[PDB]
Every structure is written in structure tokens, then in C-alpha cells.
Ligand binder design. Sequence first.
Ligand SMILES: [Cl-]
Ligand code: NA
Length: 129
Amino acid sequence: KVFGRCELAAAMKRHGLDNYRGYSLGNWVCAAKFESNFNTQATNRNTDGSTDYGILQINSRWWCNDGRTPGSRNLCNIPCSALLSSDITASVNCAKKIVSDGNGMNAWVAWRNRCKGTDVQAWIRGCRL
Ligand SMILES: [Cl-]
Ligand code: NA
């Protein structure tokens, strides 16, 4: 599923991401835009053989099981395919574990490079929340 900007913002807010660990909604929407272009089905392979999955590009190296990343962990305790669902619940719940691990949203390369330090409230502007 390819979310609209405001549609995703509302789904994220409903799932408890607004101000989660102090990150305003616009941060999450911005991250998703540059990680996946709002597409729940996005996949990308990394050099080390791990794969990033779904709207927040969660890495199989640490967070989910895809059966093809030897010596990896499954800290979210889910199959990586669950992160590709039209229902964002699994991605959000895993993102909550990631962002609490000490490094905040810096875990998301695109967020660090393209959202951090910008006017992220522009990403929810106009939306009915
Ligand atoms: Cl933080
Ligand atoms: Na695993």
C-alpha cells in the first residue's frame, strides 16, 4: 500500500507515535517519506546481505527474521514479511523498540540526513489529525 501523507500521519498518530520518545509526528512522517516513499512494500538489500523492510525500512540484521541473514537477531520477534503489510501496526511496534534503544531516530539514516534539524512540522501541515 502506498500511503498519502496525511493518511499516514493519522495512522501513525492512532498507533501512538506522536511525541513517542519525544519525536513529534512530522519526524515519523518525514522518515517514512525518505525511507520508503510511503510504500509499505518497499524492500532494499544492504551490502552485508541484510535487507530493510517496509515503510520504515527496518533492518533484518537486528530486528526481524527473513531466514536469509545468518547470525542476525530478531529483536522485534517477527518475520520481516509482517513489516510489509498494508496494516502498519507491526512496523510501528517495532519502530518503538528501535527508537528506544538509546540512539533515538538516528537509527534511520534518511532521517538523520534529510529530516533531522529541518522543519518537520511541514510534513503534517494541513492534515486532519
Ligand atoms: Cl532521543
Ligand atoms: Na533473525
